[PDB]
Amino acid sequence: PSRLRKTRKLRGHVSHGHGRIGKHRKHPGGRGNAGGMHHHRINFDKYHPGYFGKVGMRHYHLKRNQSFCPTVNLDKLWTLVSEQTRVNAAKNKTGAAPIIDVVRSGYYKVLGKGKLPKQPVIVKAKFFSRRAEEKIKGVGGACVLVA
Amino acid sequence: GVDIRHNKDRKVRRKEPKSQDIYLRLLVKLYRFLARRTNSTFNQVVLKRLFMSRTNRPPLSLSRMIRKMKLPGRENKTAVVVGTVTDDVRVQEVPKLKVCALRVTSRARSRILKAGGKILTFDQLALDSPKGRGTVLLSGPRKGREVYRHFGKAPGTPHSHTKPYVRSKGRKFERARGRRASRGYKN
Amino acid sequence: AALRPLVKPKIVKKRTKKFIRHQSDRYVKIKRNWRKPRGIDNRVRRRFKGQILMPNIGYGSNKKTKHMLPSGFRKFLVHNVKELEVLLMCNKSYCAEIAHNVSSKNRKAIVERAAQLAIRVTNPNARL
Amino acid sequence: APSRNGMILKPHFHKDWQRRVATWFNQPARKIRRRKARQARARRIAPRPAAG
RNA sequence: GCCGUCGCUGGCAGUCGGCAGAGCGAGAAAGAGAGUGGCGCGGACGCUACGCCGCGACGAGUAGGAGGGCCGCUGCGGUGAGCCUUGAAGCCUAGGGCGCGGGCCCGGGUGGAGCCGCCGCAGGUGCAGAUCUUGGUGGUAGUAGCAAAUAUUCAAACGAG
RNA sequence: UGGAAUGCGAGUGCCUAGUGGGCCACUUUUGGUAAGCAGAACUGGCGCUGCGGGAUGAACCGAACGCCGGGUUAAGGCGCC
RNA sequence: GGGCCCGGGGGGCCACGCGUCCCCCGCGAGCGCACGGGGUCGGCGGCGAUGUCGGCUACCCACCCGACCCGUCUUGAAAC
RNA sequence: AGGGCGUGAAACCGUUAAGAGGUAAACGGGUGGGGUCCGCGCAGUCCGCCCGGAGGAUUCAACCCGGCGGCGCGGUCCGGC
Ligand SMILES: [Mg+2]
Ligand SMILES: [Mg+2]
Ligand SMILES: [Mg+2]
Ligand SMILES: [Mg+2]
Ligand SMILES: [Mg+2]
Ligand SMILES: [Mg+2]
Ligand SMILES: [Mg+2]
Ligand SMILES: [Mg+2]
Ligand SMILES: [Mg+2]
Ligand SMILES: [Mg+2]
Ligand SMILES: [Mg+2]
Ligand SMILES: [Mg+2]
Ligand SMILES: [Mg+2]
Ligand SMILES: [Mg+2]
Ligand SMILES: [Mg+2]
Ligand SMILES: [Mg+2]
Ligand SMILES: [Mg+2]
Ligand SMILES: [Mg+2]
Ligand SMILES: [Mg+2]
Ligand SMILES: [Mg+2]
Ligand SMILES: [Mg+2]
Ligand SMILES: [Mg+2]
Ligand SMILES: [Mg+2]
Ligand SMILES: [Mg+2]
Numbered sequence: 001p002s003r004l005r006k007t008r009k010l011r012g013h014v015s016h017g018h019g020r021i022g023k024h025r026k027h028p029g030g031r032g033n034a035g036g037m038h039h040h041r042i043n044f045d046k047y048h049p050g051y052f053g054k055v056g057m058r059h060y061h062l063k064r065n066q067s068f069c070p071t072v073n074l075d076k077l078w079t080l081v082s083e084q085t086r087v088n089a090a091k092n093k094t095g096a097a098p099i100i101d102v103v104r105s106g107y108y109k110v111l112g113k114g115k116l117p118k119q120p121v122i123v124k125a126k127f128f129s130r131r132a133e134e135k136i137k138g139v140g141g142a143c144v145l146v147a
Numbered sequence: 148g149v150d151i152r153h154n155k156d157r158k159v160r161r162k163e164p165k166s167q168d169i170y171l172r173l174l175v176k177l178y179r180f181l182a183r184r185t186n187s188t189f190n191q192v193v194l195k196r197l198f199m200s201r202t203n204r205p206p207l208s209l210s211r212m213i214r215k216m217k218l219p220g221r222e223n224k225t226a227v228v229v230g231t232v233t234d235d236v237r238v239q240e241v242p243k244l245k246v247c248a249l250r251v252t253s254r255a256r257s258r259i260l261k262a263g264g265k266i267l268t269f270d271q272l273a274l275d276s277p278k279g280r281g282t283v284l285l286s287g288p289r290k291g292r293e294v295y296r297h298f299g300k301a302p303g304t305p306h307s308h309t310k311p312y313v314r315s316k317g318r319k320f321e322r323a324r325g326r327r328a329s330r331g332y333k334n
Numbered sequence: 335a336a337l338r339p340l341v342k343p344k345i346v347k348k349r350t351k352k353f354i355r356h357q358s359d360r361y362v363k364i365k366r367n368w369r370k371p372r373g374i375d376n377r378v379r380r381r382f383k384g385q386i387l388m389p390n391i392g393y394g395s396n397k398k399t400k401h402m403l404p405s406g407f408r409k410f411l412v413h414n415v416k417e418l419e420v421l422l423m424c425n426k427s428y429c430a431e432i433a434h435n436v437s438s439k440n441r442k443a444i445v446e447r448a449a450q451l452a453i454r455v456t457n458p459n460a461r462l
Numbered sequence: 463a464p465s466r467n468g469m470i471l472k473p474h475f476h477k478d479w480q481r482r483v484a485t486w487f488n489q490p491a492r493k494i495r496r497r498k499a500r501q502a503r504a505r506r507i508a509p510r511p512a513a514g
Numbered sequence: 515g516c517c518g519u520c521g522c523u524g525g526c527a528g529u530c531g532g533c534a535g536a537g538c539g540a541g542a543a544a545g546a547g548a549g550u551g552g553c554g555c556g557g558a559c560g561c562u563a564c565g566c567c568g569c570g571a572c573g574a575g576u577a578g579g580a581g582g583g584c585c586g587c588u589g590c591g592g593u594g595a596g597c598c599u600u601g602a603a604g605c606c607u608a609g610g611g612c613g614c615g616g617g618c619c620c621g622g623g624u625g626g627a628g629c630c631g632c633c634g635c636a637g638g639u640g641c642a643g644a645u646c647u648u649g650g651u652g653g654u655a656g657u658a659g660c661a662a663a664u665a666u667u668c669a670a671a672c673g674a675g
Numbered sequence: 676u677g678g679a680a681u682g683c684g685a686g687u688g689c690c691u692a693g694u695g696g697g698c699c700a701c702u703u704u705u706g707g708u709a710a711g712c713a714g715a716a717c718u719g720g721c722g723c724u725g726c727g728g729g730a731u732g733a734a735c736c737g738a739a740c741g742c743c744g745g746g747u748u749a750a751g752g753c754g755c756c
Numbered sequence: 757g758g759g760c761c762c763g764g765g766g767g768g769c770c771a772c773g774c775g776u777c778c779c780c781c782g783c784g785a786g787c788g789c790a791c792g793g794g795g796u797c798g799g800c801g802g803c804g805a806u807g808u809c810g811g812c813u814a815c816c817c818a819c820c821c822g823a824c825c826c827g828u829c830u831u832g833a834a835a836c
Numbered sequence: 837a838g839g840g841c842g843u844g845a846a847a848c849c850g851u852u853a854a855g856a857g858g859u860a861a862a863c864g865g866g867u868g869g870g871g872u873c874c875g876c877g878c879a880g881u882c883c884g885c886c887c888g889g890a891g892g893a894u895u896c897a898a899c900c901c902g903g904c905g906g907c908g909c910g911g912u913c914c915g916g917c
């Protein structure tokens with residue numbers, strides 16, 4: 001609301017809070033990002049290193065669906081299945097491990113961050129990290145690749 | 148005249164919650180009394196943390212609370228946080244806890260109770276621990292916010308690992324000159 | 335014979351003249367309502383001797399005698415008999431002033447009911 | 463002019479964008495109209511499925 | 515002495531009453547502790563805790579910042595069993611007052627049909643200036659002036675002239 | 676035996692306006708015959724600041740300011756104004 | 757002079773029960789006056805209904821001291 | 837409300853009344869004198885308890901009947917949610 005703003009308190013004060021000496025002029029310094037390599041060079045260099053120049057190959061017609069690859073860590077792996085899935089497997093005796101299909105949950109690659117509970121599991125995914133497969137293998141599980 | 152400076156006379160600090168919440172202020176009324184009429188420094192700390200702002204009251208996850216309540220000699224002590232206790236999906240086993248919080252997320256509540264623990268409000272901590280005895284006051288990570296990734300030496304200074312403010316992330320967005328020796332310089 | 339307050343402390347006024355705005359005696363366009371002078375060279379703003387004075391919190395009135403009428407009471411505007419009966423228990427320190435736009439007919443009821451309750455009316459003899 | 467730390471912004475308001483602002487104050491009236499044409503169409507082809 | 519600001523992140527939920535017992539300012543830690551054996555029917559105020567109370571220090575201000583306004587203007591949601599032809603708004607007032615102030619209340623007069631308080635919402639919301647806009651009015655001032663091209667006079671008529 | 680005196684509560688983080696013409700004095704000091712001239716150092720001032728005194732005055736001397744009563748002072752004064 | 761002004765042969769003490777051992781040789785009651793946690797009188801007088809009493813401010817007038825016209829740019833404005 | 841007529845401001849002007857007038861007027865502080873009005877003043881407050889005189893009554897306490905309410909660790913009453 002305009003009743004809570006500075007303008008109401010600045011009534012009666014000449015200059016409206018912009019000073020008597022410098023005044024409020026239209027566009028001192030230029031419009032927009034003018035002066036980056038010039039009178040505004042310190043601000044750009046100080047706060048925006050890398051701003052000017054070119055780096056890396058161009059790629060015409062990038063299609064971001066081609067590189068779709070959502071990832072999940074191992075510390076979140078068991079949330080993709082219900083709770084009773086884990087407790088049932090942990091307490092059963094035949095040794096049967098549940099199947100966690102990360103593609104069904106909307107992930108493609110499995111990453112290695114975290115630790116798994118000591119419980120065998122069969123994991124299905126398009127991709128694995130090297131540490132993900134080791135950690136999955138350390139609990140008695142297996143990695144299954146899908147296309 | 149007295150040769151003194153007045154710029155520092157007025158101490159900047161909260162004497163009350165900015166919030167207009169009536170349940171919070173009823174708790175501030177409660178702990179204003181306990182802080183004043185009891186010599187328990189704990190009440191003063193809790194009374195102060197009730198005035199604090201949302202970012203000064205970070206949420207405490209379940210995993211962090213379990214870690215700090217597992218340190219030796221903290222058995223049967225009530226964990227106290229002036230803030231929210233959020234659930235942590237990365238936790239597998241939830242031990243029996245007694246906790247006092249301003250808020251507990253819906254999933255954190257079920258996990259604590261299903262483990263056999265007890266959840267309190269702050270009006271119940273007073274009737275159980277008037278002076279705060281047998282308590283373990285805990286706090287969430289204050290610097291666990293995206294803003295603090297942007298504070299410090301300006302990103303364009305030597306050995307500054309400050310995060311820049313960019314509208315986009317990618318090869319074309321602030322990586323050419325000033326960030327690699329092949330383009331002008333680096334620091 | 336008028337009703338008297340519980341106590342009648344001496345009222346001390348630091349200042350009784352009004353604060354006339356600077357240069358409001360020179361123009362009709364400048365109403366005497368106070369305005370803080372803010373010109374750079376303004377000699378009233380700089381507190382030169384012999385010039386118009388500026389109001390400041392130092393002139394404040396004693397908290398005890400503040401808003402006190404010379405009768406020793408403090409006024410409270412009332413628009414009807416019901417509003418009057420909120421002063422029943424503080425009738426030794428607060429009086430009733432009837433609002434200007436209350437009909438002459440209704441002033442008889444408020445001025446009457448106030449007499450019964452021993453509440454003092456600042457303007458009982460108006461719109462007769 | 464830039465002032466201390468801040469994002470570098472490039473708003474696309476260097477054309478006559480006010481001449482081509484499309485307000486949405488007819489949105490509820492559009493939603494009613496679309497629905498009223500779904501109902502009159504459902505009546506028109508019944509018992510054929512309304513969906514199509 | 516009084517006003518305000520700042521600090522003491524000071525004190526008060528103990529109004530614990532005849533289902534009673536009044537204290538905790540005091541130089542110097544921690545209990546006005548609990549036990550086991552050897553007639554009257556009475557007692558002010560308080561506490562909108564966003565409230566109330568105490569003590570100490572201090573108070574210049576342009577540019578600029580911030581806080582509080584029970585300062586003021588227009589409209590919206592609630593509320594005031596609100597005000598008003600027994601007189602609304604507006605306007606005038608050597609009437610009486612309140613507030614440090616922004617302002618406000620009441621008395622009288624004019625007026626003739628509507629208006630206001632409180633809790634919130636919203637803003638085309640506060641003028642001394644801008645050679646500011648439009649309109650009105652002054653002093654100047656009964657003043658400059660009614661002076662280019664030779665010129666008028668007598669009698670009568672109408673007619674208030 | 677918190678290892679000199681004295682005094683004082685400290686630390687820390689975000690956001691941030693105005694400014695970016697200055698000028699003056701003791702002392703030091705460059706150019707210039709010099710200048711109420713141009714240019715420096717230190718500190719303090721005026722600017723932003725009233726008040727007593729210097730008759731008068733941006734800066735000198737004294738002293739810095741909430742609204743008051745009493746007392747006493749500073750620098751300056753006490754023929755009359 | 758210092759040693760509760762060491763020890764021996766008229767004037768002020770914030771000395772004043774005793775069993776003892778021996779160094780040395782836990783409650784009296786009252787009453788009262790006050791240089792005592794910021795003023796009271798348990799002290800008085802005159803005047804008062806037609807010309808007199810009170811009314812800060814406010815209207816007019818007077819006098820004494822003070823007092824240059826504002827906004828603004830400016831190192832500097834009462835500025836010719 | 838008299839046909840550009842609701843209200844009817846300010847500037848500016850006429851007149852009536854009052855006051856004043858040689859350092860232009862105006863202004864701050866301090867009193868004083870005079871006016872307009874206001875106190876709808878002019879023998880001066882009110883309240884509790886007590887003492888005493890005159891009186892006068894839907895006459896007090898205590899008891900009985902009925903109704904209502906508060907509380908009860910009814911040391912552990914019955915019924916209820
Ligand atoms: Mg300012
Ligand atoms: Mg300007
Ligand atoms: Mg500003
Ligand atoms: Mg500028
Ligand atoms: Mg701009
Ligand atoms: Mg001081
Ligand atoms: Mg200051
Ligand atoms: Mg400050
Ligand atoms: Mg100046
Ligand atoms: Mg800037
Ligand atoms: Mg910024
Ligand atoms: Mg100040
Ligand atoms: Mg007038
Ligand atoms: Mg009409
Ligand atoms: Mg509007
Ligand atoms: Mg104007
Ligand atoms: Mg002429
Ligand atoms: Mg400049
Ligand atoms: Mg120089
Ligand atoms: Mg020069
Ligand atoms: Mg300046
Ligand atoms: Mg300064
Ligand atoms: Mg000075
Ligand atoms: Mg001289």
Ligand SMILES: [Mg+2]
Nearest residue numbers: 744745746747
């Ligand atoms: Mg004095």
Ligand SMILES: [Mg+2]
Nearest residue numbers: 730751752753
């Ligand atoms: Mg002299």
Ligand SMILES: [Mg+2]
Nearest residue numbers: 384821822823
């Ligand atoms: Mg003079």
Ligand SMILES: [Mg+2]
Nearest residue numbers: 822823824859
């Ligand atoms: Mg003069």
Ligand SMILES: [Mg+2]
Nearest residue numbers: 827828829830
């Ligand atoms: Mg200018």
Ligand SMILES: [Mg+2]
Nearest residue numbers: 829830831832
């Ligand atoms: Mg110049």
Ligand SMILES: [Mg+2]
Nearest residue numbers: 375376826833
């Ligand atoms: Mg000027």
Ligand SMILES: [Mg+2]
Nearest residue numbers: 833834835836
């Ligand atoms: Mg000149």
Ligand SMILES: [Mg+2]
Nearest residue numbers: 625837842843
């Ligand atoms: Mg009319």
Ligand SMILES: [Mg+2]
Nearest residue numbers: 626627837842
């Ligand atoms: Mg009409």
Ligand SMILES: [Mg+2]
Nearest residue numbers: 841842843844
């Ligand atoms: Mg008209």
Ligand SMILES: [Mg+2]
Nearest residue numbers: 841842843844
């Ligand atoms: Mg008319």
Ligand SMILES: [Mg+2]
Nearest residue numbers: 849850851852
């Ligand atoms: Mg006239």
Ligand SMILES: [Mg+2]
Nearest residue numbers: 853854855856
């Ligand atoms: Mg005359």
